């Protein structure tokens, strides 16, 4: 599965979660921001790297990035 990594600047604006087309994300309770929410990526094996999330997250130095890895039947999302 392609690698994912949140950062303490996760403002919890959910735009990551609001974007992912693969449910690779979800919002948990947190404390470090006023929204008390930090994004969480518990299901890496279904991210295909479409990077809609990295397109979203408005932290100035991003907050939560994706990194490309090896492939499989489950991973690449190929119907055949």
């Amino acid at each position: 599965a392609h690698i994912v990594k949140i950062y303490d600047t996760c403002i919890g604006c959910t735009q990551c979660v609001r974007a992912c087309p693969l449910d690779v994300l979800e919002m948990v309770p947190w404390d470090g921001c006023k929204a008390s929410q930090m994004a969480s990526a518990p299901r890496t094996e279904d991210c295909v790297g479409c990077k809609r999330c990295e397109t979203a997250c408005p932290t100035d130095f991003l907050s939560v990035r994706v990194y490309l890895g090896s492939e499989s039947t489950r991973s690449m999302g190929l119907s055949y």
Binding site: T9, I11, P58, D60, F61
Partner: protein, 61 residues
Amino acid sequence: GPKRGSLVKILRPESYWFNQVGKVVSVDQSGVRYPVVVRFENQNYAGVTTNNYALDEVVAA
């Protein structure tokens, strides 16, 4: 931090506004790690004109 509307100089290396100066919107009196809020007038590579920072990262200039 400095009172609202004050002008500080961003210094976070990664920050698109690095080594530049922006207007502080406000600072949270509470204990969040980046209570500083800094408007700008030159959007970054995604179209944003206001960024958040910790205390140290800025200099009121």
